[PDB]
mmCIF file of C-alpha atoms in Angstrom:
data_model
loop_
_atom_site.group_PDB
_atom_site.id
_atom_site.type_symbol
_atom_site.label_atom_id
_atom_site.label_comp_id
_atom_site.label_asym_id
_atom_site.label_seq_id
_atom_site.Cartn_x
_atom_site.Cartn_y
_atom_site.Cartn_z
ATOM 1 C CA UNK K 29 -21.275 -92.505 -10.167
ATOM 2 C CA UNK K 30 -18.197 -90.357 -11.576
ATOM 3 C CA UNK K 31 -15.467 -89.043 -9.728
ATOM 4 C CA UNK K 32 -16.013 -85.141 -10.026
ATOM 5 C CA UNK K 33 -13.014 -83.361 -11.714
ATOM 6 C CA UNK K 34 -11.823 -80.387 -11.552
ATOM 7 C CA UNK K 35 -9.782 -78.460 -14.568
ATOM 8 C CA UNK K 36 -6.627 -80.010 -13.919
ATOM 9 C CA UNK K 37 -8.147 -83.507 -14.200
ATOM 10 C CA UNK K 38 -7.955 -83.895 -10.244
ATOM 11 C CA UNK K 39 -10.468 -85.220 -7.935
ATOM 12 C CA UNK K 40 -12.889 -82.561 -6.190
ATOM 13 C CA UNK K 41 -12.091 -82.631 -2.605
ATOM 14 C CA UNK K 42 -14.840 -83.513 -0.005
ATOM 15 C CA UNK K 43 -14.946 -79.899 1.588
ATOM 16 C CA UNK K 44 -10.924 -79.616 2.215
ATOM 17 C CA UNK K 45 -10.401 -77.531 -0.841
ATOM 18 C CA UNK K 46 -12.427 -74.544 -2.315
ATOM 19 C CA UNK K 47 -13.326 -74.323 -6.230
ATOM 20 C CA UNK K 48 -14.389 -71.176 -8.472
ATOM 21 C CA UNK K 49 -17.571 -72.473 -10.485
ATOM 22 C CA UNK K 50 -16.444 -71.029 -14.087
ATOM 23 C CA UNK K 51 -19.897 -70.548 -16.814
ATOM 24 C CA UNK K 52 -18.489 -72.183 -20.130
ATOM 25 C CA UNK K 53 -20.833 -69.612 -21.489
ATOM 26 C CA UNK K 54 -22.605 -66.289 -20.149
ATOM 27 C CA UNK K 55 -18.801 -64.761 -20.525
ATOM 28 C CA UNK K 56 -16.620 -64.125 -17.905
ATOM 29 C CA UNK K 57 -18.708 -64.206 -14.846
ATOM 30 C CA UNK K 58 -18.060 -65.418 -11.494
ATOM 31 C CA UNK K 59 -20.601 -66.012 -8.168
ATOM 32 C CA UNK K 60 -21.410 -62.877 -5.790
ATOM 33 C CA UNK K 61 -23.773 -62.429 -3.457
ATOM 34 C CA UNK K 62 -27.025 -59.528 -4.411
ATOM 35 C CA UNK K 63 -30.281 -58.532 -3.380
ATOM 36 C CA UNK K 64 -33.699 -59.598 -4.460
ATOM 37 C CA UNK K 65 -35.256 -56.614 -3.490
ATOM 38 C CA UNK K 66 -35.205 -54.581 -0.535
ATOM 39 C CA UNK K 67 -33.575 -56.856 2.226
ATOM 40 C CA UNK K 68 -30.773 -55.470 4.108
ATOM 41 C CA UNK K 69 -28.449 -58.203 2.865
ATOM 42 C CA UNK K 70 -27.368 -59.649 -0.124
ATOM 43 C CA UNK K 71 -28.323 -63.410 0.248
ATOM 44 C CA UNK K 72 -28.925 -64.405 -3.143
ATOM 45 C CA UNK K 73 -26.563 -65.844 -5.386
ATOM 46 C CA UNK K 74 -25.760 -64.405 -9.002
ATOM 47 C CA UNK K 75 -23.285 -64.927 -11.667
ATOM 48 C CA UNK K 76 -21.837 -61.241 -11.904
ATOM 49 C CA UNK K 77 -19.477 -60.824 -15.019
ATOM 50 C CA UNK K 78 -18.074 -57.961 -12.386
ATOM 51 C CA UNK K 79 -16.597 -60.434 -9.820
ATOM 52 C CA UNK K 80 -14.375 -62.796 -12.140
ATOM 53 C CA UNK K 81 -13.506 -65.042 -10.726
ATOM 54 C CA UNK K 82 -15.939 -65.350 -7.829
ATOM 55 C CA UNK K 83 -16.589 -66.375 -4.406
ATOM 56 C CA UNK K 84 -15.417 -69.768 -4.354
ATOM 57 C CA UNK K 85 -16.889 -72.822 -2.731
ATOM 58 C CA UNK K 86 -16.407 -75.810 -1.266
ATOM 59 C CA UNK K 87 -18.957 -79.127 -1.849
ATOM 60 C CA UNK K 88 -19.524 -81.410 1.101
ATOM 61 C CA UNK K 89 -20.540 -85.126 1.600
ATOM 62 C CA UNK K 90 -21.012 -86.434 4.863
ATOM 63 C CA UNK K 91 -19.589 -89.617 3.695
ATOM 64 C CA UNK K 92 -15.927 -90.983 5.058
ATOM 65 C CA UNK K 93 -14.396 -90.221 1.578
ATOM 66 C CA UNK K 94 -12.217 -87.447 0.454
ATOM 67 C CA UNK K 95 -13.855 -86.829 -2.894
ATOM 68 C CA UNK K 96 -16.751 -85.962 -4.625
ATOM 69 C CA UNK K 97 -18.733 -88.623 -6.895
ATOM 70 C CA UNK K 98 -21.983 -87.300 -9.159
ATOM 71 C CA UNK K 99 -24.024 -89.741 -6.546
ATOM 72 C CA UNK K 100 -23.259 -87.365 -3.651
ATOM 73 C CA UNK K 101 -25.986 -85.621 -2.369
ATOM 74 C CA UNK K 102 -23.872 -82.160 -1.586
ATOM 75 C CA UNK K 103 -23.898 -79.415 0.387
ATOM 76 C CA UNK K 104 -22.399 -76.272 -1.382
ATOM 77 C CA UNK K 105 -21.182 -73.504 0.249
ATOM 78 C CA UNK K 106 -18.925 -70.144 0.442
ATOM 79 C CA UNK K 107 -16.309 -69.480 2.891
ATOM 80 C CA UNK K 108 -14.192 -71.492 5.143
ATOM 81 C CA UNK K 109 -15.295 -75.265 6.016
ATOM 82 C CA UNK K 110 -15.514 -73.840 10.070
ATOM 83 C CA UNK K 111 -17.795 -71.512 9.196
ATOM 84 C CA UNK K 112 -22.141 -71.691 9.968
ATOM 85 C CA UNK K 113 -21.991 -69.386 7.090
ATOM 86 C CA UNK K 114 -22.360 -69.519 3.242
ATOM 87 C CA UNK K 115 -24.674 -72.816 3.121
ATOM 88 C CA UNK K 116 -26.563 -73.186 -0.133
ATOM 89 C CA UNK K 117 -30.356 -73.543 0.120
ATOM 90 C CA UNK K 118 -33.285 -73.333 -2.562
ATOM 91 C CA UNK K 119 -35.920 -70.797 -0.967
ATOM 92 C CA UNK K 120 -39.050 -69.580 -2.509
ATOM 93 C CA UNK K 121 -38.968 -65.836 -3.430
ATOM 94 C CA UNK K 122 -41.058 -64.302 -5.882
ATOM 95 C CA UNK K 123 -39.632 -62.683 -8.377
ATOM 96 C CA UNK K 124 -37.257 -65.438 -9.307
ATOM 97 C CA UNK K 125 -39.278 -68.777 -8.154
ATOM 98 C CA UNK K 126 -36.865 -71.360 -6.522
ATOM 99 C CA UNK K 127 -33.673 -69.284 -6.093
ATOM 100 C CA UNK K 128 -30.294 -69.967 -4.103
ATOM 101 C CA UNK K 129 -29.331 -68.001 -1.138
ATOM 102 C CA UNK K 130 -27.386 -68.231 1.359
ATOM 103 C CA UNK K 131 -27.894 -69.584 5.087
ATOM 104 C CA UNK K 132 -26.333 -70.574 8.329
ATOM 105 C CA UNK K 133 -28.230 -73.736 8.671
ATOM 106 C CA UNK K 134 -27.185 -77.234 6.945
ATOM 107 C CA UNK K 135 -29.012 -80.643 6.767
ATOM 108 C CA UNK K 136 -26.689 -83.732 6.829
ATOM 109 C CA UNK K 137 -27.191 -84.527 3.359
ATOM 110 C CA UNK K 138 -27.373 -81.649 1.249
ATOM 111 C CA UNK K 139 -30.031 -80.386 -1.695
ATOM 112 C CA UNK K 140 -27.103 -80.747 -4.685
ATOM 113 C CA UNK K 141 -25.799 -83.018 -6.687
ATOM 114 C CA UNK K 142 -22.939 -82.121 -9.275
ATOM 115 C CA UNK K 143 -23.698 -83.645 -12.520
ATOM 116 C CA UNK K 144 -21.723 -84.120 -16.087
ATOM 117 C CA UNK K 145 -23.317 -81.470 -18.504
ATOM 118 C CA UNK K 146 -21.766 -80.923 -22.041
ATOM 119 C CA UNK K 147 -18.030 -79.838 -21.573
ATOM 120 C CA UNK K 148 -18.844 -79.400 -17.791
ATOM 121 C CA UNK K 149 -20.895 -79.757 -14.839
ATOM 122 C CA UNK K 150 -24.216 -78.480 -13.710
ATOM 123 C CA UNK K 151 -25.800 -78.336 -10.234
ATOM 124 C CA UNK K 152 -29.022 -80.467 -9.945
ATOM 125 C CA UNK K 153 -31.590 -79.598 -7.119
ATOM 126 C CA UNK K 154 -32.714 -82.702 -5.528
ATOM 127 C CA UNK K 155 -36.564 -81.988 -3.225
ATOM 128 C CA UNK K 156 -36.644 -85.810 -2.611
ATOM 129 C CA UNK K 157 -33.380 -87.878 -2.334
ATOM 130 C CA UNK K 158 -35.718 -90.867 -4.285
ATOM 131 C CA UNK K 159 -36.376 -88.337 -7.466
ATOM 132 C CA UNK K 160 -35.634 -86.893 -10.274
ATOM 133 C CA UNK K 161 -33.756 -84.019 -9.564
ATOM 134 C CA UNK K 162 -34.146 -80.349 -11.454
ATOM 135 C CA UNK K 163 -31.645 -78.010 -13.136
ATOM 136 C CA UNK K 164 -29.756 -74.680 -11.534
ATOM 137 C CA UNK K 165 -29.845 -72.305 -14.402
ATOM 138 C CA UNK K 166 -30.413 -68.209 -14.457
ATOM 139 C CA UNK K 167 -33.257 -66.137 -14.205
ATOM 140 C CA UNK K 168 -32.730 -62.692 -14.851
ATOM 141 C CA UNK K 169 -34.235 -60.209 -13.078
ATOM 142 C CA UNK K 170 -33.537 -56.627 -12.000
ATOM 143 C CA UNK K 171 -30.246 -56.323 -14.275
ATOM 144 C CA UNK K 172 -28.854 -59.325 -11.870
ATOM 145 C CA UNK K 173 -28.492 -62.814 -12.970
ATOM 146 C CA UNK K 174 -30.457 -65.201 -10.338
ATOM 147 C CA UNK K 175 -28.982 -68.622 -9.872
ATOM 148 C CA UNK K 176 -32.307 -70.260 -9.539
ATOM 149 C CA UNK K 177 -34.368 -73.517 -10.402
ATOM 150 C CA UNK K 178 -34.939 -73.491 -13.863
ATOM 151 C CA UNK K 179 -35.289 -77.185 -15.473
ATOM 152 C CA UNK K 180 -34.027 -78.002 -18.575
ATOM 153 C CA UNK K 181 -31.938 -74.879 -18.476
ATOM 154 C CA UNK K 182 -28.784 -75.485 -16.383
ATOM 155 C CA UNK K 183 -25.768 -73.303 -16.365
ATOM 156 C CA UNK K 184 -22.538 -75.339 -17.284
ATOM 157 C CA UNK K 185 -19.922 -74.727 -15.091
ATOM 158 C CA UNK K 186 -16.196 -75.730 -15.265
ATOM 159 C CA UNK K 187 -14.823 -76.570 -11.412
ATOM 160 C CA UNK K 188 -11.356 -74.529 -10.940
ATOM 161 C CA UNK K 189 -9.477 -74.928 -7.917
ATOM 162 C CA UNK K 190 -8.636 -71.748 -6.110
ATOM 163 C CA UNK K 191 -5.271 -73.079 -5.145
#
């Protein structure tokens, strides 16, 4: 039910404003986009301590509010809010399990919540809106850290704005 904050003490905006996800651990990392394997593109996401401080993102509710509670259901994505581009999903792929990547498609209420976590947040993946939900956390694979569904695991993030 918590108003999501972001390092300043402000209010995450609903989409309007883009945030870098900062680990509180795992060093200086930031989000980038790798391969799996041998697909053309990179679609999964990583925390990279190369790109510091990331690719930043923006969290949407569909909701007529300009803020983000831990009750959201979220989508989570990179680039601009116009864009079909950057959307979050959980896909099977199997070296990882349940990783993110990124897509062009986007349900109305998203697979993420954004949930207190020690001195931060976490991302929770939700497969049934009237469930438990399960930790995003690392799997490492392939000298590449995996965002991916690992329960009881999550990475803590702090929530930056880009300005």
């Amino acid at each position: 039910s918590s108003v999501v904050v972001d390092t300043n003490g402000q209010p995450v905006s609903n989409g309007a404003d883009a945030y870098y996800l900062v680990p509180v651990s795992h060093g200086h990392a930031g989000l980038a986009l790798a391969k799996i394997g041998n697909e053309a593109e990179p679609r999964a996401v990583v925390l990279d301590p190369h790109h510091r401080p990331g690719l930043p993102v923006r969290f949407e509710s569909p909701l007529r509010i300009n803020i983000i509670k831990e009750s959201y259901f979220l989508n989570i994505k990179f680039g601009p809010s116009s864009s079909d581009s950057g959307v979050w999903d959980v896909i099977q792929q199997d070296p990882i399990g349940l990783a993110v990547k990124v897509t062009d498609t986007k349900s109305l209420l998203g697979p993420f919540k954004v949930e207190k976590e020690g001195e931060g947040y976490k991302i929770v993946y939700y497969p049934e809106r009237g469930q438990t939900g399960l930790d995003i956390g690392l799997v490492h694979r392939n000298d590449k850290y995996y965002l991916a569904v690992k329960d009881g695991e999550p990475c803590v993030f702090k929530i930056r704005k880009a300005t």
